[PDB]
Each structure stands twice: as structure tokens, then as C-alpha cells.
Subunit: 141 residues, 2 copies
């Protein structure tokens, strides 16, 4: 049922989303049981200085919440979006020196992806920070 529901979405991504959910410096994956510990770090700055481990730890915390809140029926969808927005705010594109750029990773369950197909289709077309902020703004309904 986990594979079975994951399979339909992965087939649906192939069919209608051209094999991917890449958006603006961020892509979504659709998995029933993600290996979230494989996406973590162990990070200490010594001698009490913000080296940037916090930024890392915050990113992991938010990816986790974005998944866990997606993996249940009926979570507040605007509050979910606000979490994505905080992730997006905290992301800082690892642009490999020259003119290269990379994508932040987020994960959502298959049930959630398939309750929100139109939304994930728009996600892919986001082209700026300014559009992104508008797209993720917490509407009432």
C-alpha cells in the first residue's frame, strides 16, 4: 500500500510532470518512507561562533516537518505552505564557483502529492523570489 500508492504517483510524475518536480532552486521528491537520516549532517562550531551549522540544522528540521505534515490526512495546507516558505527562505543555493547553481531537496508523501497535483504543476513554473513569495503566501482558503 506504501509502494502501491508511491508507484501510482511515480507513474503520474512520468506521465504528466515529465519525470520531475524541479522548481525554482528547489525540487520535490515523492516517497512513502524517505531516508531522512541520510539527508542529515553532524555539525559543531567550536568556541561559540555562528559558523553556519544552525542554518544546516534548521533546513533538516523543516524538511522533516514538511514531510511529516504531508504524511497525514488534513493538515492545514496554508500552514504547510508557510513551512515550505521558511525552508525556501533558509535555503542558500550551493552555486559551484563560476556560474553554476543547485536545488534544495524536499520530500512529500504520495497521498499529499496526489491531493495537490495542480499545485505541484504550478510549483514547477515559479521563476523568481517575488513570484515564489506570492505563491507561498498564507491565504485564508
Amino acid at each position: 500500500i506504501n509502494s502501491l500508492e508511491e508507484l501510482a504517483a511515480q507513474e503520474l510524475i512520468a506521465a504528466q510532470f515529465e519525470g520531475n518536480l524541479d522548481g525554482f532552486f528547489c525540487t520535490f521528491y515523492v516517497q512513502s518512507k524517505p531516508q531522512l537520516l541520510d539527508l542529515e549532517s553532524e555539525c559543531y562550531c567550536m568556541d561559540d561562533f555562528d559558523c553556519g551549522c544552525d542554518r544546516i540544522k534548521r533546513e533538516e528540521e523543516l524538511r522533516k516537518l514538511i514531510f511529516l505534515t504531508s504524511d497525514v490526512y488534513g493538515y492545514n495546507f496554508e500552514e504547510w505552505k508557510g513551512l515550505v516558505w521558511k525552508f525556501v527562505q533558509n535555503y542558500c543555493p550551493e552555486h559551484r564557483y563560476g556560474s553554476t547553481f543547485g536545488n534544495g531537496l524536499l520530500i512529500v508523501s504520495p497521498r499529499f502529492f496526489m491531493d495537490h497535483l495542480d499545485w505541484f504543476q504550478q510549483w514547477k513554473l515559479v521563476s523568481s523570489n517575488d513570484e515564489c513569495r506570492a505563491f507561498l503566501r498564507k491565504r485564508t482558503q
Copy 2:
């Protein structure tokens, strides 16, 4: 022993620079023997997955080079500035609920400072990424 040079700098900072070297999301200190090892991390990812450690290691690496190359006479100033650009490029403030809008930290030798005071005044009154881009890339003087 080598404080004499630092204090000559600290006196000029207080006297002629309003007591700081803050610029556009970044700050210079002037130190003869900085404790760069204090300003460090020991952190790793798990998977092949880039968890954001690479950006921190790069930051330290560049910070240290920025200091070491300032700590001798006659280094290629344009190339020195090139390191500063790569540092700024690789920097990003941590953002959660707008504020805070924080500063990166660089350190430079007393003598390097005292041979480029004029350049350091211009560094302060930068206030955009494009002003930063131009100021660092354009042949000085």
C-alpha cells in the same frame, strides 16, 4: 610583542572609521595573530548528498586565505579582491521571520589595513550586491 601594529590599527579604526569596518552584509576585523581555529567547524554529511557542509568549509578556507595573503607584502591586490568576491558569493545570511539580516566575518593584517585605508572606506559605503560586484571586480585606482 606585535600588538603595536594592531593598536595603531585599532586607534585608526576608532579615530577615522567610526570604530568599525562594517559593510554590505560583511565585516572586517584587524588582527595580527587571529585565532582562526576558534572560527571553525568540524562537520560532515552522511550520503553522497550535499548537506551544506561544503559551503562552510569553503567559507573558512577563503577566510583563512584572505588573511594569510594580507599578512605579507606585495600580494596581487586584484587577486586578493578575487578571494573576497568568492567569499561574498559563497556567503548567505540566516533568515527566519525577516530579521536577522546578518554579517559575514573577514580578517586582515594590521599592515594590509594600514596600506589600504582608503579602499576600506569605500568598502563601508557599499549597500547593494551590484555595488559589491562592481567594487570587487573593477581594477582599483
